[PDB]
Amino acid sequence: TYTLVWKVWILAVTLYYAIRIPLTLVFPSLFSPLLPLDILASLALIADIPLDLAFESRPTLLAPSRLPDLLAALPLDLLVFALHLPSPLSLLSLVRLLKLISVQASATAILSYRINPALLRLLSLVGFILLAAHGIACGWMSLQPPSENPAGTRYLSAFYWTITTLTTIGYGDITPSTPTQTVYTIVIELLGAAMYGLVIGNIASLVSKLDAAKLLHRERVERVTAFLSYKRISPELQRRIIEYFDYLWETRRGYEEREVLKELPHPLRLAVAMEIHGDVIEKVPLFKGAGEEFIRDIILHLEPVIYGPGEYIIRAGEMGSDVYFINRGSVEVLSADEKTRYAILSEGQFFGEMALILRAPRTATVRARAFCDLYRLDKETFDRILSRYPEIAAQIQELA
Amino acid sequence: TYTLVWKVWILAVTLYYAIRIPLTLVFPSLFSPLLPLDILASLALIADIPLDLAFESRPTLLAPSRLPDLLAALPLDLLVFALHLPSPLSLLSLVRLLKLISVQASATAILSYRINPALLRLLSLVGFILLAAHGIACGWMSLQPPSENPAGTRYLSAFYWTITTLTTIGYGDITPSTPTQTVYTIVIELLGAAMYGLVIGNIASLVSKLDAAKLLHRERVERVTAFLSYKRISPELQRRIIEYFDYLWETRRGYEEREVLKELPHPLRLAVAMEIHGDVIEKVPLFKGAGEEFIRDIILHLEPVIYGPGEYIIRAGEMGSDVYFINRGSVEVLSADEKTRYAILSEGQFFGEMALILRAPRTATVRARAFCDLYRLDKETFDRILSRYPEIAAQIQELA
Amino acid sequence: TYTLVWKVWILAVTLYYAIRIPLTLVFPSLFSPLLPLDILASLALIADIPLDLAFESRPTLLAPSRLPDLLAALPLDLLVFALHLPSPLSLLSLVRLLKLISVQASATAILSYRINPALLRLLSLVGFILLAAHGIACGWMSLQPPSENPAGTRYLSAFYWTITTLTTIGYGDITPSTPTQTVYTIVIELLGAAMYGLVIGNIASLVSKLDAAKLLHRERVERVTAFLSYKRISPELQRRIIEYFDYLWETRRGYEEREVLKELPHPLRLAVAMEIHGDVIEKVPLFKGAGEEFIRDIILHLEPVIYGPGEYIIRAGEMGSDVYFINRGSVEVLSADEKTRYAILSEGQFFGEMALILRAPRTATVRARAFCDLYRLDKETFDRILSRYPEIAAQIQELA
Amino acid sequence: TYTLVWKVWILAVTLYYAIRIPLTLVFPSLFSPLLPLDILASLALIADIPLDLAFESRPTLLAPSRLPDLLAALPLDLLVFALHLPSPLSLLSLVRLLKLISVQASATAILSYRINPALLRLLSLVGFILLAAHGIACGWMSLQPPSENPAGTRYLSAFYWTITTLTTIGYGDITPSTPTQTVYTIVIELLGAAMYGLVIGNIASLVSKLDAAKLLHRERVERVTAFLSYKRISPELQRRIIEYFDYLWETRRGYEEREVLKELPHPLRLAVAMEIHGDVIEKVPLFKGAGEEFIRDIILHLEPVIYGPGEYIIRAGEMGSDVYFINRGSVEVLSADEKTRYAILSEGQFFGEMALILRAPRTATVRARAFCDLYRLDKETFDRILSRYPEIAAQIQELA
Numbered sequence A, B, C, D: 001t002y003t004l005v006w007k008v009w010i011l012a013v014t015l016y017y018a019i020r021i022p023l024t025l026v027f028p029s030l031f032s033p034l035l036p037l038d039i040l041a042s043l044a045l046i047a048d049i050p051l052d053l054a055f056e057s058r059p060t061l062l063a064p065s066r067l068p069d070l071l072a073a074l075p076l077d078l079l080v081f082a083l084h085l086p087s088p089l090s091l092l093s094l095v096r097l098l099k100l101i102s103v104q105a106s107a108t109a110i111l112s113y114r115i116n117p118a119l120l121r122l123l124s125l126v127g128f129i130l131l132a133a134h135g136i137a138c139g140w141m142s143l144q145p146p147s148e149n150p151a152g153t154r155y156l157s158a159f160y161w162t163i164t165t166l167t168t169i170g171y172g173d174i175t176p177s178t179p180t181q182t183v184y185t186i187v188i189e190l191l192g193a194a195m196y197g198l199v200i201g202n203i204a205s206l207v208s209k210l211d212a213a214k215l216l217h218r219e220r221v222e223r224v225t226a227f228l229s230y231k232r233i234s235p236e237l238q239r240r241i242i243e244y245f246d247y248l249w250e251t252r253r254g255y256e257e258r259e260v261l262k263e264l265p266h267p268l269r270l271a272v273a274m275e276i277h278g279d280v281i282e283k284v285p286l287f288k289g290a291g292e293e294f295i296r297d298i299i300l301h302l303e304p305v306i307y308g309p310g311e312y313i314i315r316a317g318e319m320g321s322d323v324y325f326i327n328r329g330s331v332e333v334l335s336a337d338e339k340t341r342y343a344i345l346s347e348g349q350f351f352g353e354m355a356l357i358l359r360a361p362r363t364a365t366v367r368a369r370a371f372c373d374l375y376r377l378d379k380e381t382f383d384r385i386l387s388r389y390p391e392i393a394a395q396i397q398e399l400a
């Protein structure tokens, strides 16, 4: 979109002015050579203040917002330079630099999504500090005694001084020699201390948030381990729990499915649940013929559970009541004595369907081959769901 | 209220003393010219210590509170200056400056609401640092060898030194030349390091809290996106969820209605719910004649839900049971084959009323035109509510 | 307890050694004058390593813990000073200073309750930095060329240099002149940068936690206000909600009773609930004769609710079901037309008792005079409680 | 595993290059003496870029990942040194140093578990800063005027300058004398300010997280104490609650069992619950003969509760319904008048079994000897469990 290109162009124009205005205040002879750009740049500025009125909600000129735009659109710089009027009034040429805050707001709004906000604020602060350093170096030159030194070396020395002061390094090889330079130095010292404190605070804020997920996982694991140590839990079970948390981190950054899915609204939660359990519940022979309404109601009630390697999901002879769907990993179905393996079931398969229709003991043992992500449906909830689908209840009773 | 103006006046008086007392300790000749203000200022102080006793709960003189007020109300400064007594005892003139902490407490209490507390602490620290810098410059002058330099240049040099030290820039063009100046320099170096660390910590605390809502939204979105990536969700559904979160941010800063309304007490929650659902439930033909008690009970149980563009709220033939109220956005009511559009419903309208009275299949499909903020009422909860209003139950049964 | 006094004495002894050992390494002549204290101090140290074995669980000598104690109990300093052996081996005299970490652990454990842990860590760091500054000044003197300067001025200059370096101020009036002094300066510069970064981090951590309750209240209020602004809530209701939050802050720091009471175990929660509702439920005529078991069961189920000024708690003719207990504030009981006031009820009184026994409409309107802290008991929960006390149910039915 | 040893070897090789390359750029004569190591080191690098392809998922050469590895595997350094080609093109020899970020990633991945991530980032930053300081000192030497000074003293002076600048101490005894040195100084000043801000931010982040559990406990206790102070709770009950929180901290760091056990999945939660309640529920005479299924169902529903010293768990004559299992601490069973002690029960014992079968009043009072960790089973939940085990219900009814 060309409007963003216009905003980038105005970024360039305001940077042009932030560079040129103090550098022209210290070197008046620089005015006329760059005059054809100045009229070009100022025109662009007068082009902007009516433009964004068509985008602010895609005319509150009396509000504090849009005040720096119009205040910085006045051709004060041209008049000040042309009139060669005295410096104490010439300083009003800087009023155009108030466009900087509006340009910062625009850049923040057009980079508010691709860039971390803390990093965006840090980068904006760094750019502002570089521009302020340029301005402060120009002021330092303006207070320096006249000399035959080339303008480039003068600017280099002033920028060296201002960087030495703002960074608080303070070599002191360049120091104020006059009372006005001393007052200016005091002001710049306070400003540099504030700017460097802002830099440090922004960096601290940025870096304190980097490992949020990993630090949350670590605090969770330490809490659990300390509590289990208090309860005198044996180290084997503690090792199994530690490796469970290792699995949870390496697979899904320690996030709980139960808590993540609550952050979605019901239509999106239903879409996600239908996506994850794709055809796994619509391939079950118990309710192949069921309507999609019953399928949706079943899908919304599946509870995620993770079983570790070798953990028993079902033991033969237990008065079980739950059916399980394998979302990831694999399980072995074993005899009641576990001396022989009836089957291996893998991702996309299911077991325990008999518990939903009958109330009989479990036919065979089920044991996880490794870390299995499974979904559990309780017969209590299955009956609750059947309570509102009499046709499906009749179908399943006929099957039973 | 004039009491706040009195507190501002005492702010001015304590700033007057914090400036004058060390500057008089270094320039005794400054005493008499400002004497008519001093008696004016000290009187104001003796006017204060009985005054706030009428406001402290709107007389605990033995408590640590109100101790700095009375301790700083003693006319020690006048006696010390008048007696021209020796400097080691003259330093007791500074006891009046203990009013500063009480004035800071007062300013914090009268600006505790309009101003962010972290920013308020930062500003108080900055003011304290400026006053301390003035005092330290006065001490530096007090340890300097006598000279014919004008008092203004002496103060400027001392303030330059103390600012250079406190900001930790340390040019070193002004350095202690005597052992007493060296001890003073060491003390001031430690104090300046502590003050600048306090400044940096306050700035870091302030800036780490700026984007709390945006950072919470970002961490939520990253958690959800990472989890959906683990579940191998298709990118179309991920895009729909991302645009849902974009809508949630751009409309309501990512806040959950369900969680915001829990932070209000029941009377205020009821007032808010009655305000939002204004006449939308009192215009429904199903219960036009119902009493306001039933209306309130219904209003408290409406559940907010957001549907994205093109999402199906109701599909024809479904065994639906919920009525929906459109709080924002618009929906289209479509035929069972969706090849024709029966109607468009907008903000303030409702659909699905038949499900509450009957138990019949849905007559027509309902699909969101865009992001719709809707309120859902389940027939289970509607029946729960009807259980306590037999007259309304009879009315609705007669309608059915 | 005298054991804490012993630990304070050993604090004094370890500070004595941390001062003396480097100062004796630079001034050997200081050894013999303080020898009678040294044997006194070292004896105290050899007295400690068997003592705390009786307190460590109120003998794991092979563990890393208690290793610095025994390692710092060896009389190495006495031998090094007496042998006047060469400096590269004389540096082993510093091994006694390893008592510092054990003394820091002891001080942290005996001040872990009266003092904020972050402030405790900051103070420990500051003390360690002062001791390290003393040691570094001694090293700087040890690398300085011999001179006739008095020892006091030499120490003052070295301490000035080390404070100037550690605080990163860096005047540079004292600088290394030799390669060994340059290497030492580099090491001390890195150490000072690390120490000052530690100071800044500790201060930032301390100050970022100061206003936790106030910042939580502010973020809550901003969230609620922003959400209500999105919902287009009228400014009058917003003002009422703002003043409700103001009341909540000024009374109880914004804490929710419902959430605070969940942080207590059941016996303590019951004790607190019995304390708050003291005789208010045991004075009700409905169940004066009830046993204390029923009283406890009733007391555990009272729900706190806050009503704002002028809010209607009960309106005449409503099909109400709740009884209310006034814990603070006062309410007015008014006629059905509100044109006359039947009564005013205050702290410790109750209203709405008829709703529990009968099912009749409310006899009169109840309206809050100001912010009232009330407790609500629902007839549904009252019936649940009566279900387990048949005698009390019979009593209340006889009353009805 | 030898692969980790290979990664450590490549750590050594990349450190070798990061040291040698700039030091050879400033001292070309250093090239040939270390040439037999260079060919040895570069070979190792060309050995790596095919190796990790077998481990990246235990070949995406077009991705940004693995780009620095191949870019840093080119023998550019050998050619640049052998060709003695001009310095502006010789600077390309540094391209090999891009191996540093890959080595940092590898070290982070192989130390991501034993080391706190914040501390790991801080240590990596410190190492990077030391290497950068070496490089910057080499650049400073490269811009220095030729002199007869020994290379060691030149390097020492350059390293002194760069450490003085990066730490922001800034003595200023060594300062740029030429415009190119001034530009280099400005760049290094900005880089050092950024690096020191990074150090401070990392330290602040690290130290702000140290006392997370203790600070959470303190904020909990302050919240509870403030709320109880508002409710005008008597100081005796407040003292009992404070000592309860002291017990909770000293035993289990203030963690709630109810919340810790929710962070485990159902199989691990069941394993932990079976471990804690080991034989305590399988020794009860009420259900000695019960199957392990009923035992598991009972075990999952035990609620933890802590009773303070002297607190009454059961009072004689109460219409109680709960059985209690002593996990830690001890209780006394006392007569109805409490004038005699029937028994003392300790860890691993139980009381209140009669309430589960009968509905009779409590036979005797039970009072905690000290802080008791107990588990409560309610008859309501016991009946819920019995509802699914008819055989056990028949057994317990026969016992009753």
Ligand SMILES: Nc1ncnc2c1ncn2[C@@H]1O[C@@H]2COP(=O)(O)O[C@H]2[C@H]1O
Pocket (backbone or CB within 6 Å): A314, A320, A333, A342, A343, A350, A351, A352, A353, A354, A355, A361, A362, A363, A364, A365, A366
């Ligand atoms: N031969 C088999 N092959 C595969 N799965 C089986 C086999 N026998 C039993 N199962 C599954 O093992 C489950 C154990 O619990 P159920 O008896 O409830 O339901 C059983 C089936 O889902």
Ligand SMILES: Nc1ncnc2c1ncn2[C@@H]1O[C@@H]2COP(=O)(O)O[C@H]2[C@H]1O
Pocket (backbone or CB within 6 Å): B314, B320, B333, B342, B343, B350, B351, B352, B353, B354, B355, B361, B362, B363, B364, B365, B366
């Ligand atoms: N012609 C129509 N115009 C507007 N709304 C309709 C029309 N026909 C059906 N509806 C609404 O569409 C809803 C679909 O669900 P119901 O059958 O429960 O209730 C239906 C009405 O609320």
Ligand SMILES: Nc1ncnc2c1ncn2[C@@H]1O[C@@H]2COP(=O)(O)O[C@H]2[C@H]1O
Pocket (backbone or CB within 6 Å): C314, C320, C333, C342, C343, C350, C351, C352, C353, C354, C355, C361, C362, C363, C364, C365, C366
């Ligand atoms: N004359 C009165 N004086 C005090 N309280 C009253 C009076 N009349 C009614 N009430 C109280 O007002 C309440 C309004 O609700 P109820 O009818 O449930 O119960 C009523 C009593 O608790």
Ligand SMILES: Nc1ncnc2c1ncn2[C@@H]1O[C@@H]2COP(=O)(O)O[C@H]2[C@H]1O
Pocket (backbone or CB within 6 Å): D314, D320, D333, D342, D343, D350, D351, D352, D353, D354, D355, D361, D362, D363, D364, D365, D366
């Ligand atoms: N003599 C006793 N010795 C040990 N425990 C007892 C004794 N008498 C009663 N109890 C226990 O005290 C409990 C008090 O509550 P119950 O009557 O429910 O169950 C009682 C038994 O568990």
